[PDB]
Amino acid sequence: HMVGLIWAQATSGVIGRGGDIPWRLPEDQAHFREITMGHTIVMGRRTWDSLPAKVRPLPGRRNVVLSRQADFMASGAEVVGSLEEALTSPETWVIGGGQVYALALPYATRCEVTEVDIGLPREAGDALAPVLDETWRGETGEWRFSRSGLRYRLYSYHRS
Ligand SMILES: NC(=O)C1=CN([C@@H]2O[C@H](COP(=O)(O)OP(=O)(O)OC[C@H]3O[C@@H](n4cnc5c(N)ncnc54)[C@H](OP(=O)(O)O)[C@@H]3O)[C@@H](O)[C@H]2O)C=CC1
């Protein structure tokens, strides 16, 4: 069972605020599909709730939602009460949010990280990216320009 994490962060490490992602990067959707299509995607229940009803579940992937709530209904997803329960297919991508990235990092051998060149200083209640330690290796891709007006770039990090 391989596990990867995929996220986008501002240079501050902020990934979420007010139940949403505080930028848009339409051009990076193809990369997100490329990585995740045909695989299991795992997300925390706050990330599931952040997806509009019309976009969820994400098509072409097995959607799994992590919650402690016995009852919890996430229609079009399988709800599980632990991360280890999700991790049963050959390839699983954790697609957010902050709590779940922190839970899943020990299990991961890939992180696909888009860095957005925005000064987005941290504020109370923000969701933050996990911190990568020295075990991680990988390169910094070249800058790309979004029509949203922001530069962004892709880190493909991996470890054994
Ligand atoms: N790339 C990006 O920039 C991304 C940003 N985001 C953003 O991240 C934010 C959401 O992140 P965050 O608030 O950290 O929430 P999460 O999406 O990580 O969801 C947290 C919920 O997951 C469940 N959960 C957490 N830990 C466990 C556990 N150990 N066992 C079982 N269930 C667990 C809980 O559900 P419950 O309360 O039901 O028990 C918890 O409340 C939003 O702003 C979202 O837009 C999301 C995805 C990508």
Side-chain angles (χ1 to χ4, degrees), residues 2-160:
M2 163 282 172
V3 174
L5 277 53
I6 177 163
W7 80 86
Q9 61 180 58
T11 60
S12 56
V14 171
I15 66 166
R17 171 172 300 177
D20 200 346
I21 296 176
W23 61 82
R24 296 291 184 265
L25 224 54
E27 298 85 352
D28 202 37
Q29 289 352 91
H31 161 244
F32 180 82
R33 293 190 113 231
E34 186 53 34
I35 290 295
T36 60
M37 192 62 50
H39 302 301
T40 292
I41 58 177
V42 178
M43 68 194 95
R45 190 261 315 156
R46 298 174 172 167
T47 295
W48 171 261
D49 284 352
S50 85
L51 304 177
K54 50 244 91 223
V55 223
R56 80 195 184 186
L58 292 196
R61 283 153 287 192
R62 177 183 166 240
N63 292 41
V64 174
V65 172
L66 183 60
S67 179
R68 293 196 189 87
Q69 294 186 72
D71 47 305
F72 190 71
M73 145 140 269
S75 183
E78 173 172 355
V79 171
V80 299
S82 68
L83 175 65
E84 298 72 15
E85 283 166 86
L87 299 188
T88 70
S89 302
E91 178 160 347
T92 298
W93 285 90
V94 172
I95 66 158
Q99 293 189 185
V100 180
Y101 291 134
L103 206 50
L105 189 62
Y107 294 115
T109 39
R110 291 185 59 185
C111 293
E112 286 286 302
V113 181
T114 293
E115 177 172 67
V116 187
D117 183 359
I118 188 177
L120 195 74
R122 297 180 186 182
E123 310 281 11
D126 285 348
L128 307 178
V131 184
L132 299 199
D133 73 11
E134 296 289 59
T135 64
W136 290 94
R137 305 160 269 185
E139 309 63 56
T140 316
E142 305 290 302
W143 288 109
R144 300 193 202 111
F145 295 65
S146 176
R147 73 173 183 251
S148 71
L150 299 176
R151 209 158 72 118
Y152 64 103
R153 61 185 177 185
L154 178 62
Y155 288 83
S156 298
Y157 293 116
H158 45 92
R159 65 176 174 176
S160 285

